[PDB]
Amino acid sequence: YEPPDPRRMYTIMSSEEAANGKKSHWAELEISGKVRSLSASLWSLTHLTALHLSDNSLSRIPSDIAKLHNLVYLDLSSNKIRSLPAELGNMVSLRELHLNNNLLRVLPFELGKLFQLQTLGLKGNPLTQDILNLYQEPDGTRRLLNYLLDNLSGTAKRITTEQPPPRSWIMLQEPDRTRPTALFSVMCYNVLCDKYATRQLYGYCPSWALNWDYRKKAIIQEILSCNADIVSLQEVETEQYYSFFLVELKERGYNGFFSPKSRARTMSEQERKHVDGCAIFFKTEKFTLVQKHTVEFNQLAMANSEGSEAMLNRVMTKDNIGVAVLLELRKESTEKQLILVANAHMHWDPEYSDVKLVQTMMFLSEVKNIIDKASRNLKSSVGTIPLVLCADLNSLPDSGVVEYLSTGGVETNHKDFKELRYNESLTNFSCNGRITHGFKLQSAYESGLMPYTNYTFDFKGIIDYIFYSKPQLNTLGILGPLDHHWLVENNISGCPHPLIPSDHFSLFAQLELLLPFL
Amino acid sequence: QRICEVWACNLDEEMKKIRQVIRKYNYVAMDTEFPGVVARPIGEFRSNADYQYQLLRCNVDLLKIIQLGLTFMNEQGEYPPGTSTWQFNFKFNLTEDMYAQDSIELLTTSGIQFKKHEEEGIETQYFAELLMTSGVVLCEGVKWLSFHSGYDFGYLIKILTNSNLPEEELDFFEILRLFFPVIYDVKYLMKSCKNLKGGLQEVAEQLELERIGPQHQAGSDSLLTGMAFFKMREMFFEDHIDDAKYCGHLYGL
Ligand SMILES: [Mg+2]
Ligand SMILES: [Mg+2]
Numbered sequence: 001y002e003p004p005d006p007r008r009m010y011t012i013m014s015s016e017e018a019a020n021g022k023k024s025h026w027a028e029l030e031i032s033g034k035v036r037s038l039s040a041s042l043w044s045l046t047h048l049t050a051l052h053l054s055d056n057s058l059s060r061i062p063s064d065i066a067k068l069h070n071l072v073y074l075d076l077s078s079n080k081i082r083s084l085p086a087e088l089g090n091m092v093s094l095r096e097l098h099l100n101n102n103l104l105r106v107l108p109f110e111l112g113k114l115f116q117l118q119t120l121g122l123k124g125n126p127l128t129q130d131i132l133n134l135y136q137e138p139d140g141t142r143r144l145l146n147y148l149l150d151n152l153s154g155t156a157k158r159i160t161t162e163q164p165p166p167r168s169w170i171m172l173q174e175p176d177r178t179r180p181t182a183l184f185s186v187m188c189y190n191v192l193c194d195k196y197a198t199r200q201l202y203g204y205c206p207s208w209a210l211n212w213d214y215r216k217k218a219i220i221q222e223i224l225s226c227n228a229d230i231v232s233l234q235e236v237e238t239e240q241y242y243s244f245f246l247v248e249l250k251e252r253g254y255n256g257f258f259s260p261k262s263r264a265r266t267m268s269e270q271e272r273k274h275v276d277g278c279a280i281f282f283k284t285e286k287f288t289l290v291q292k293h294t295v296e297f298n299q300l301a302m303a304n305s306e307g308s309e310a311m312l313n314r315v316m317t318k319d320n321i322g323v324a325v326l327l328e329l330r331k332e333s334t335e336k337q338l339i340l341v342a343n344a345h346m347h348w349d350p351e352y353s354d355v356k357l358v359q360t361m362m363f364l365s366e367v368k369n370i371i372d373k374a375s376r377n378l379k380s381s382v383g384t385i386p387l388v389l390c391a392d393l394n395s396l397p398d399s400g401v402v403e404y405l406s407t408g409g410v411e412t413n414h415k416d417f418k419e420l421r422y423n424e425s426l427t428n429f430s431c432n433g434r435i436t437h438g439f440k441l442q443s444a445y446e447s448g449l450m451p452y453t454n455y456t457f458d459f460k461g462i463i464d465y466i467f468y469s470k471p472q473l474n475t476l477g478i479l480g481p482l483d484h485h486w487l488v489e490n491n492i493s494g495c496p497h498p499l500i501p502s503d504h505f506s507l508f509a510q511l512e513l514l515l516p517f518l
Numbered sequence: 519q520r521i522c523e524v525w526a527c528n529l530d531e532e533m534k535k536i537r538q539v540i541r542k543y544n545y546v547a548m549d550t551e552f553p554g555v556v557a558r559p560i561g562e563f564r565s566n567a568d569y570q571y572q573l574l575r576c577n578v579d580l581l582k583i584i585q586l587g588l589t590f591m592n593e594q595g596e597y598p599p600g601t602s603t604w605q606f607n608f609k610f611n612l613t614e615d616m617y618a619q620d621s622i623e624l625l626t627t628s629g630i631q632f633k634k635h636e637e638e639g640i641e642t643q644y645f646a647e648l649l650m651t652s653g654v655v656l657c658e659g660v661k662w663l664s665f666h667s668g669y670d671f672g673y674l675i676k677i678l679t680n681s682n683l684p685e686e687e688l689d690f691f692e693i694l695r696l697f698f699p700v701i702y703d704v705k706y707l708m709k710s711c712k713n714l715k716g717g718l719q720e721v722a723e724q725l726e727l728e729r730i731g732p733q734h735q736a737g738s739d740s741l742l743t744g745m746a747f748f749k750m751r752e753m754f755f756e757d758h759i760d761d762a763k764y765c766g767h768l769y770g771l
Contacts, residue, residue, distance in 0.1 A: 007560065009558075009563065010562055011565070011566060011569070012562050021564075025562060026561030026563070027561055028559065029558075029560070030558050032558075032618075033554060033555070033618025033620065034620075035556055035619070036616070037616055039580050041580055041682060268680070
């Protein structure tokens, strides 16, 4: 049972081994060289059954250490470790651990779950006075694990003692009946992909509430509750779209279109599995897709000039960060009126406003060209096509990124352009001293009916939006915010939260389109 | 100025050149400097040489190559016009990645620009593709030279396959035969010759070969490996090597 004290290899005797020829099974490994960190390919050795990481300069321990489900021994003596992970409690098979001469303040409560741990070493660590008192008692090893397991009951994960009140609905207008009209509901939701949903960012959020298997079920219960005739999503891992979101949503009657944010990487499958992107769904009973697009800049539509080239370098990013689809209203819910529905996500942070601002002009400028390409052949006569735009611009409502959309244009000197103020190349994107575009859009949640669409610990603001062409479209109602008083009763510092799957809130809003003639 | 430093910025350009130089200069010497050894298994082994592979397995899979050097020459033993050797400097991050402390100390004294490697290092994944298209590897009539090349070719397989090394010591050889039909380990040849022992620099003194570039660097060592092979072939082997006997043998394996 004891591992051999000599850390030396052993060879089978030649005469007996060679004749029998049994294979070489090595189950023990050592790591030395006062290494600073560890590698990921180490956690792939599931066959290992005893690991010697003693006498190193290991700062921390990854959670993927638990990937050695067969491990029955572990040594971390004389290392520079500050604390242990929580996933260590899932290594039941472990039967002996050593933590001597480290910088351990308090052991994780999950450690008591290791009911097979017969021996434990702790000499040389700064542990609470009481922990050192239990370890001295006879059979203090068993006694201490029971204590750490007694404290794990204090955490009481998934109590869920609170209850979520429903979100209220607000009415902005009645549906006028002067002319025939079409009414369809829209949703916008940034589901917070798993790749960027770490605890380092959302530290107020327990690990079981961050688990994608836990959120993905609560997310979908939200998209189905709203039953929007159009659903627009952001931060959706490609794997999860095809194998989860598009699966569960077809059962309810949707047909979606996805597109990843990056295509030129061409990484391995595993890398490509967790790439996120923007998806658009729609009820078939009301819509019928006529086209699909993944927005990109042709890069030649502008007048070939060194300045535009010199500029675009500072701005362009390999990610397309944009998706759009063209739909068709079915006769029953001659003219054949269509609707373009766009979806976008700006990852960049507020400090890079010049990128987000030019990227936005870039995005919309490409939209206008896509509409014209379809408004020629498919439009019955000449020939306007509406635009239902929903995006997560990661921009507040006063920002320039948002000024460009609401006011129909932005000044060439806007604070957000920063170094790019007055660059001649910017004037090209408009259709002077100001950049304008043909669209005349209007926000669906104007007047700040939702105080904030992203509620984190350090940031509260409005970054998700739903726009529309005012001459064509109107909004009859929007889904108001969560009872703010509830957020206080429960001391919710930020999101995600046991009861709140994403870090954003959903934007369900009802629209109205004008039908002429028959 | 035979040696040439290769970084990610000036990589794809050089590969275009090597594509054309390899036709007339098919013999290639190779050496790599890596973040030392860190891991050693314990357990029953079929043979001492069997362990040696298992040892080489763990560390190749676990660590990233730091620098590579390749000297292209013809069967006569002549360097091509222009730069003779290319020193490939890989993207090794001093913080995130793993390495033995003493191993980094030696590479600092050798002159590796660690910080410049992180910022302007070569992405191994992409480099593999270019080396694949060039055709140096996996081409009938291309022969490979190397000294203490267990780890050397170890890392090269992981790069080109982008996978951990096979478990079976047999599975590792069968793959090595394809990418490199003909290999000659310089040390395995020294076993046959008399009065030849020790490290590489010790061999250079016996054979009176001047040292060009920074000693104990991947690029410089690669150049010294190739020249030390031609004069060794002309001297102890009479300008000829028996393939079947010495082709495909790596010292310690
Ligand atoms: Mg986000
Ligand atoms: Mg070397």
